[PDB]
RNA sequence: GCAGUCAAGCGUUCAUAGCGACAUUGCUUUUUGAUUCUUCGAUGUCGGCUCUUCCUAUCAUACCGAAGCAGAAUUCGGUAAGCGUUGGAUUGUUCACCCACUAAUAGGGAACGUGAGCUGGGUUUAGACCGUCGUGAGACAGGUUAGUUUUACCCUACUGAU
RNA sequence: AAUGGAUUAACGAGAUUCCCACUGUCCCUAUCUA
């Protein structure tokens, strides 16, 4: 052909990077996922899956997320209470702060 | 897909578990529901039912066998009342099958009192001969004997018994001295009103 | 509602507002974008003869010397030499964001506001000389 | 000609009287009409202060918006607060019963949670909700001092 | 279109094909007349039979001349399988004995609505409507015959393997009872019965298998015995082109 | 002729004759069964209606599209005192 | 590489958003789609169910990176505090108001170097290098003005979409310090951004990515412990067809 | 719903009815379009088919490049000027009428989208908020 | 109905004399009515007519009546009445066929606007006929009668109906009336084609033009008909110039 | 349709004095899907806005049946009228035919439903023009334009009210 | 072809077609006064 080839060519000649830096860039992969078992699909001991979580009690529609119960606090005893979110007037998002 | 797939999936597989006997019992009640669908059936449905179970009966037995009427004038003419105000009852059109000839070319509108309409021209019509069976669609020439009037010789109207002269040159008949025959008296034998097809004996 | 005010204040016929018209004048870049636009077939001076004040096209350069000597333009002249009126003043007003709006009205007064008026100074230094 | 505002053809000619299905002019309102599958949100006491706070807003608050209903004073007793609208006008009287069968749909067994209950006022474009809150916005008045 | 044909819907036998259409006419349209009527209603009504009967033929005929995949100008291979198996000249007659069929149709249903306006009568109109009905069931009983042969190779036109012969395949091509059958059934998902007869695949055989993320499809012969080298079997004849068309190993 | 373009019908015929009614308090048709294990209850009771109001609610729906979000919607409030027993009736079924 | 999909929809990066250190899932329906993730990234890192003013569409509303989450303008503080509560302290999570509220659309980013929509602000475009702290660059790929949508990355490499030139490439591939391959996802989509999400160490796109499709991302993204992406040059027989 | 469009759609106030002229909102080049049916409408009597935001509608084109003119092809409605509602407490309203021009498959013509694009057109089609530089 | 007066008055003439555009006669006359007229009416004369020949110069038309003489007589003729060319002559054409006939209905058999009922008006010599440059004029034949022998019919206009032939020339030959086009700035091109640099710039005289999409805002702004709000109106001057192609108001023709 | 052919039956008893169902053959413009661009005198007035009801000969939706019915889709066929059958483009126009949506754009009746509901668009006076025929008054093969029928308070019916 | 024909500026409570502006004619009805 060679007047299509180069269309081609647009996706296999790759890009370099020319280096440009004295600052070095590593990726990260955090330990916890490197020490993490892979998934097994049919096994006696694996892990619950949410999906499967959600099938023992309704459906796929009827069950019901706690959207809580699952994020970090200091003191898991109020992990389920409720923001007042106004007084009188004047929101409270607005009003509090640090100290 | 991938050619055929189903007679392939009853040998490695079966048909079913009853299907044998399901089949089975099936003609047992076709037995009672031949005569069920002839009782019931109300309304046509039981017209074409019996047209096609006599049908049967006539199929199964070959194989035991193996081992002019009088035309008023106040049809043919139609009123037509011209004008703004339609009052004038003068002229008349001819509503029944007319040859027209071959070089026609129409009398103006003003002069003309009879009217032949341009549907109603047949200028070919199926030839039956007698003799040797075959049907010839051959094109009519001229029109020579009309019944019921001599006056509808000269418009031509087509209806029954009229003996038109049709020509006869695919045939190719061999008279005496062998010149050659080209044309005939044919007799039609329908109204053209019923069907647009002409049909004319060829007399022998 | 009325009659008067549904003909020229619908949403179809609404004009352009106070608050852009503030920021086109604000820096000497937009000035010369739309003193100087590209001519486009569907704008009633062909895409030339625009006041920057009233967002509004003029049909010939003869209606922009008898545009500017108006009452009608000496309105947005006046209408446009403070602060612009955004969401924050009227949030300012109940008690809430002061250091967002004081911060605002701080540079308006500093910076902001001498780079308008030096930029109002030059329209005129400019549609004279050329009309 | 003879209006605009009604069925033009009332009827053909057979059979001779008009029929009993042809919509004409009469009585508008004022029947009897049954309405189901209503749902309570709150069951308020009477004895109890700051009906109308919720578990979010924590402003004691009656569920009497200012100056009452219109047309309907204020409301110190036990209340329904029922979602919808129940035929029927202020001042009137109703008759709640229940439900007449098991109902089957989701909707039904869900449990609601109130976040916040109006009380602004209905005679007007009402924008305040406790008239604290208007002696708090505006400031003082002339009246006042 | 290309690389599948099973979209045609079906066809009837001219027995069932006439009943359908004289059946959908009496069903749908008003049935009911009157001597005591204006003659322009009664003339009317029965212009209204011949047209709609006229174009419910029709609209059967345009259903089998748009499905069949008009041999000429397919590809040089799908025309060339289709030549031995159906037959290319009773194939192209058939189909152009309808379309000759179709046309005789639209020349009755217009003359007999054209004629039928100078009805004068109700026992004139009434025989105008019976011919336009006898001379279309007579092109349909005429048409028996081809009706037939299409209905069997429409069964057969489904159940072809979809093949591209632009795309990359491969031929596995040798003697009856080798043991390419058992090739096919180890090297991709097939169901390729491997009976230990001499010819036991009587068409191609197709399935699909993967190297290098790329996708080969493997073609089937039935295997050849060449021994005139002029004339052969069609069963084998489908190898020759397999092998002569499809450009691939 | 054949009406030439079907519609449906303007009105519902089942809520006819449409005529004043025979008391302010309407009369209840029909009350839920018996079930005849269940503790003594009440079945119905009567109140007085008086004005609207908005109510914001975080639907808790599984399924739908406002699953765990925020929805304002009007709701309705009867005042209702507590209602004090003056009799007892009882009813022999018949075969009228 | 993970073939996935929402509800029966291809496209992954307008559903969902994926750092290093967290991820974000919609809502929608059934926890079909939020398990999925699970299966393949765990209990190590948040995976947290949220909304972006209410909507479904929260891979194209925020932009962010291991060190920090930037929000819109139409966030409520509700769906604000919900994400705090959720991640650890470590991620900076700052609500940024400006004209354009499309924060997926207009910010694409690795934990390092950034690109940004061109007419936006001179104002965030230090708020994104105090918060994500990374190096802003305006630019275009291609002449394509949103570059959150048509240009993937990760600190390993990026892909971009098949339109861009050769010249583009390597103007673009200096600034961002990684290899880029012109590439389809979802059967010839162009776009590449919202077609897929991509960590460090995973990448999932939806059912329509063909065999082809994977070979170029496990070797641009350098899935795998054993591919150094010059794999990509054996592959070029395929690609070749392709 | 029909074809593209993921999950359901609400009820909002139908701002164009049939023959109503929008402005176009991509860099596709067509500049007004002009409807000529709404897809998934009902049928009624005397009605009219009326678009609301987030509809795909047959739509041809009045002005723009010659290559665009006179064919019909779907078109989908990102701002309306009729008041809606919210579910959260507010009506609301825009500017003018506006459309992006589509496939039926939902995807988009061009590349770019000019103006904001509305909040439940935006949920309801995925191509578009690929698309869109501004929501609400 | 306007096929059934076609057939109508073919069945009632003797001679019909066809008219032909002398700007175009090739694309101009017909193409099922004369293989109609050898196949079931062959004594027939079936002549043409070249009309509308001093909007053509002179050795043009003279060169369409030679081209066409191996067939047909085909006269050369100019339908007006005060200043006619050709009238003593197809008045003495007449008077041969007559003399074979020793009355003779004689229709007027054509394609649309190009003036059958204009000639009419030049052979009786009075306004008989209703002559309008919108191409629907008549729905119905009228006898017309002069030499107490030849009667003058004219049928309307035939369009023959024919996919191609083309999409757009039908605008360019007077069939539709072009008020009635739903955009008619793409049919500009091709009037450019059509109508040369010279004979375009002598009428409207502006300047040069290139690229048929300013050309008409180059006359927009010099007819000064815009919308209101400083618009060229994109269609009222493209309808202008469709009419005075049509109309004959610039000069065009199909060079032989 | 005509002209044959074949023959279970019919003809006072009856093959062959003579009829003839069920089948079938005669061509009815060319055996290789090329096209046929053919609308051939509807002599006559209803059509449409609003609105209700009724048949089934069912276009959709309920449930079955049968087919090379792998699925997906799609056809034939039965029981069934509960419910639903549209928005536009050219002539007074129904007649005749497209464009798009839709689950589907099914067929009919009730004085070819419906003028003391509307419409006067068209149907039918007197004014006027052009064309044909007539010496003429005038009529038309015909075309165009302009143009008065206007209760209800009566008994019944129906929707409401004592 | 003074049974008068072709042409044409201006003028018209004359006959017909379209384009901008515009709007309850319409989608689809609501309300106020005498
Ligand atoms: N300049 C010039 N114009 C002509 C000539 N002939 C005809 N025309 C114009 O063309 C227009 C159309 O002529 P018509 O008599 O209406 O032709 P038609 O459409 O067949 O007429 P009908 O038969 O009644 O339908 C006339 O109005 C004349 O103005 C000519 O010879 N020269
Ligand atoms: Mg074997
Ligand atoms: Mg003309």
Redesign the interface.
């Given at each position: 052909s060679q007047s299509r080839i180069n269309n081609v060519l647009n996706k296999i000649h790759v890009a370099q990077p020319q280096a440009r830096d004295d600052v070095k860039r590593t990726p990260f992969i955090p330990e916890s996922v490197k020490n993490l078992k892979k998934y097994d699909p049919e096994d006696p001991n694996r892990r619950k899956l949410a999906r499967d979580i959600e099938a023992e009690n309704g459906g796929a529609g009827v069950f019901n997320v706690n959207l809580k119960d699952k994020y970090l606090l200091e003191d898991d005893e109020w992990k389920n209470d409720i923001m007042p979110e106004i007084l009188d007037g004047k929101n409270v998002y607005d009003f509090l702060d640090p100290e | 897909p991938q050619n055929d797939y189903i007679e392939r999936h009853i040998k490695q597989h079966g048909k079913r578990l009853d299907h044998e006997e399901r089949k089975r019992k099936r003609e047992a009640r076709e037995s009672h529901k031949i005569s069920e669908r002839a009782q019931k059936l109300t309304g046509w449905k039981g017209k074409q039912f019996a047209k096609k179970r006599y049908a049967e009966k006539v199929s199964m037995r070959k194989k035991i066998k193996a081992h002019v009427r009088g035309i008023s004038e106040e049809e043919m003419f139609k009123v037509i009342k011209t004008g703004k105000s339609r009052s004038k009852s003068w002229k008349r059109m001819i509503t029944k099958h007319t040859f027209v000839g071959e070089g026609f070319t129409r009398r103006p509108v003003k002069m003309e009192r009879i009217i032949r309409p341009s549907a109603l021209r047949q200028k070919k019509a199926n030839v039956t001969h007698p003799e040797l069976g075959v049907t010839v669609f051959l094109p009519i020439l001229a029109v020579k004997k009309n019944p019921q009037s001599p006056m509808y010789t000269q418009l031509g109207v087509l209806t029954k018994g009229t003996i038109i002269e049709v020509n006869v040159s695919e045939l190719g008949m061999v008279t005496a001295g062998g010149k050659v025959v080209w044309g005939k008296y044919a007799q039609v034998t329908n109204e053209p009103d019923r069907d647009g097809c002409v049909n004319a004996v060829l007399l022998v | 509602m009325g009659r008067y005010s549904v003909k020229r204040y619908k949403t179809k016929r609404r004009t352009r507002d106070l608050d852009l018209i503030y920021n086109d004048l604000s820096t000497k870049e937009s000035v010369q974008k739309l003193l100087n636009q590209p001519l486009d077939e569907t704008k009633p001076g062909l895409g030339q003869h625009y006041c920057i004040h009233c967002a509004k096209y003029m049909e010939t350069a003869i209606a922009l010397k008898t545009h500017l000597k108006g009452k009608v333009h000496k309105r947005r002249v006046k209408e446009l030499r403070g602060v612009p009126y955004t969401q924050e003043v009227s949030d300012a007003a109940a008690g809430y964001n002061l250091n967002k709006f004081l911060n605002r009205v701080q540079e308006i007064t500093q910076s902001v506001g001498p780079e308008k008026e030096s930029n109002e100074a030059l329209l005129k230094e400019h549609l004279d000389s050329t009309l | 000609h003879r209006g605009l505002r009604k069925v033009a053809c009332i009827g053909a000619w057979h059979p001779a009287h008009v029929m009993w299905?042809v919509?004409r002019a009469?009585?508008?309102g004022?029947?009897?009409?049954?309405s189901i599958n209503h749902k309570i949100?709150?069951v308020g006491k009477?004895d109890d202060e700051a009906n109308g706070a919720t578990?979010?807003?924590?402003?004691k608050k009656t569920?009497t918006?200012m100056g009452g209903?219109?047309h309907?004073g204020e409301?110190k007793?036990?209340?329904?607060?029922?979602?919808?609208?129940?035929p029927?006008?202020?001042?009137?009287?109703?008759?709640?019963?229940?439900?007449?069968?098991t109902n089957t749909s989701?909707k039904a067994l869900?449990?609601?949670?109130?976040?916040?209950?109006?009380?602004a006022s209905?005679f007007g474009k009402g924008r305040f909700?406790?008239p604290?809150?208007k002696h708090?916005?505006m400031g003082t008045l002339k009246k006042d001092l | 279109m290309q690389l599948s044909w099973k979209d045609i819907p079906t066809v009837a036998p001219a027995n069932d094909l006439l009943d359908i259409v004289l059946n959908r006419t009496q069903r749908k349209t008003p049935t009911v007349i009157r001597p005591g009527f204006k003659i322009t209603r009664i003339r009317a009504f029965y212009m209204r039979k011949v047209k709609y009967t006229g174009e419910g033929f029709v609209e059967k005929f345009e259903d089998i001349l748009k499905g069949f995949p008009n041999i000429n100008d397919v590809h040089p291979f799908h025309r060339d399988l289709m030549d031995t198996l159906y037959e290319k000249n009773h194939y192209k007659i058939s189909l152009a004995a309808i379309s000759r069929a179709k046309s005789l149709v639209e020349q009755v249903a217009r003359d007999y609505v054209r004629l039928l306006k100078f009805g004068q009568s109700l026992f004139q109109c009434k025989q105008l409507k019976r011919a336009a009905l006898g001379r279309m069931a007579t092109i349909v009983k005429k048409l028996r015959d081809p009706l037939a042969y299409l209905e069997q190779v429409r069964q057969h036109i489904g159940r072809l393997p979809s093949i591209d012969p632009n795309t990359r395949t491969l031929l596995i091509c040798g003697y009856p009872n080798v043991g390419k059958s058992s090739f096919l059934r180890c090297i991709t998902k097939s169901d390729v019965d491997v009976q230990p007869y001499a010819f036991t695949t009587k068409s191609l055989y197709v399935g699909h298998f993967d190297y290098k993320y790329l996708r080969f499809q493997a073609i089937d012969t039935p295997g050849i015995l060449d021994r005139p080298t002029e004339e052969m079997n069609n069963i084998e004849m489908q190898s020759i082109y397999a092998i002569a068309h499809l450009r691939s190993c | 002729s054949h009406r030439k373009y079907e519609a449906p019908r303007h009105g519902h015929l089942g809520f006819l004759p449409r005529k004043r009614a025979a008391s302010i308090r309407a009369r209840v048709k029909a009350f839920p069964k018996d079930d005849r294990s269940k503790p003594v209850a009440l079945t119905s009771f009567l109140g007085y209606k008086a004005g609207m109001t908005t109510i914001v609610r975080d639907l808790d729906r599984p399924g739908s599209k406002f699953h765990k979000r925020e929805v304002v919607e009007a709701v309705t409030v009867v005042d209702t005192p507590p209602v004090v027993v003056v009799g007892v009736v009882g009813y022999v079924e018949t075969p009228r | 590489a993970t073939r996935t999909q929402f509800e029966n929809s291809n496209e992954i990066g307008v559903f969902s958003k994926l750092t290093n250190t967290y991820c974000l899932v919609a809502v929608g329906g059934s926890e079909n789609f939020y398990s999925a993730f699970e299966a393949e990234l765990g209990d190590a890192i948040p995976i947290v169910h949220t909304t972006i003013a209410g909507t479904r569409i929260i891979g194209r509303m925020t932009a962010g990176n291991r060190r920090g989450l930037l929000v819109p303008t139409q966030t409520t503080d509700q769906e604000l505090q919900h994400l705090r509560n959720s991640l650890p302290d470590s991620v900076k999570i700052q609500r940024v108001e400006e004209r354009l509220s499309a924060l997926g659309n207009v910010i694409c980013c690795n934990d390092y170097v950034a690109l940004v929509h061109p007419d936006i602000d001179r104002e965030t475009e230090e708020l994104i290098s105090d918060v994500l702290g990374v190096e802003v660059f305006r630019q275009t790929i291609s002449g394509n003005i949103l570059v959150g949508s048509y240009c993937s990355l990760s600190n390993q490499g990026g892909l971009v979409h098949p339109q861009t030139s050769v010249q583009d490439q390597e103007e673009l591939s200096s600034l961002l310090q990684v290899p880029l391959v012109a590439g389809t996802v979802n059967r010839g989509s162009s776009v590449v951004g919202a077609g897929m999400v991509v960590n460090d160490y995973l990448a999932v796109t939806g059912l329509d990515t063909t065999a082809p499709e994977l070979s170029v991302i496990e070797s641009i993204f350098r899935l795998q412990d054993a591919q150094p992406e010059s794999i990509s040059g054996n592959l070029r027989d395929t690609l070749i067809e392709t | 719903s029909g074809n593209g469009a993921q999950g359901t759609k609400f009820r909002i106030s139908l701002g164009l009815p049939v023959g109503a002229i929008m402005n176009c909102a991509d860099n596709s080049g067509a500049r007004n379009l002009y409807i000529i049916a709404v897809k998934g409408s009902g049928s009624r009597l005397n009605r009219l088919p009326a678009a609301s935001l987030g509809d795909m509608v047959m739509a041809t084109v009045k002005k723009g490049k010659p290559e665009l003119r006179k064919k019909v092809m779907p078109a989908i409605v990102v701002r309306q000027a009729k008041s809606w509602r919210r579910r959260d407490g507010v009506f609301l309203y825009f500017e003018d009428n506006a459309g992006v021009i589509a496939n039926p498959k939902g995807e988009m013509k061009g590349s770019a989208i000019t103006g904001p694009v509305g909040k439940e057109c935006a949920d309801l089609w995925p191509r578009v908020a690929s698309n869109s530089g501004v929501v609400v | 109905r306007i096929w059934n007066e076609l057939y109508k008055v073919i069945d009632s003439s003797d001679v019909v004399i066809h008219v032909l555009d002398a700007r175009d006669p090739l694309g101009t006359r017909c193409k099922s009515v004369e293989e109609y007229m050898k196949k079931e009416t062959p004594h027939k004369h079936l002549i043409y007519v070249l009309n509308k020949c001093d909007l053509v110069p002179t050795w043009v038309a003279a060169a369409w009546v030679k081209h066409l003489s191996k067939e047909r007589p085909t006269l050369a003729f100019h339908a007006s009445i005060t200043n006619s060319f050709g009238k003593g002559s197809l008045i003495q054409l007449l008077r041969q066929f007559s003399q074979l006939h020793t009355q003779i209905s004689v229709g007027f058999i054509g394609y649309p606007n190009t003036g059958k009922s204009s000639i009419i008006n030049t052979l009786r010599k009075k306004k008989v006929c209703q002559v309008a440059p919108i191409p629907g004029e008549t729905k119905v034949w009228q006898y017309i009668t002069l030499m107490k022998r030849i009667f003058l019919i004219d049928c309307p206009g035939i369009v023959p109906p024919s996919s191609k032939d083309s999409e757009e020339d039908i605008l360019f030959r007077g069939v539709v009336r072009v008020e009635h086009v739903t955009h008619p700035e793409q049919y500009i091109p091709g009037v450019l084609k059509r109508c040369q640099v010279k004979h375009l710039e002598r009428t409207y005289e502006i300047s040069g033009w290139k690229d048929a999409t300013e050309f008409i805002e180059i006359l927009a702004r010099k007819q000064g008909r815009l919308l209101k709000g400083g618009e060229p109106d994109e269609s009222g001057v493209s309808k202008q110039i469709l009419n005075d192609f049509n109309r004959g108001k610039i000069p065009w023709f199909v060079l032989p």
């Open positions: - | - | - | 299905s919509a009469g009585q508008r004022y029947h009897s009409r049954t949100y709150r009477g578990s979010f807003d924590r402003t569920i918006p209903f219109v309907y409301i007793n036990d209340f329904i607060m029922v979602k919808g609208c129940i029927g006008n202020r001042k009137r009287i109703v008759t709640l019963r229940k439900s007449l069968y989701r869900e449990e609601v949670s109130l976040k916040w209950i109006d009380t209905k909700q406790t604290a809150e708090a916005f | - | - | - | - | -």
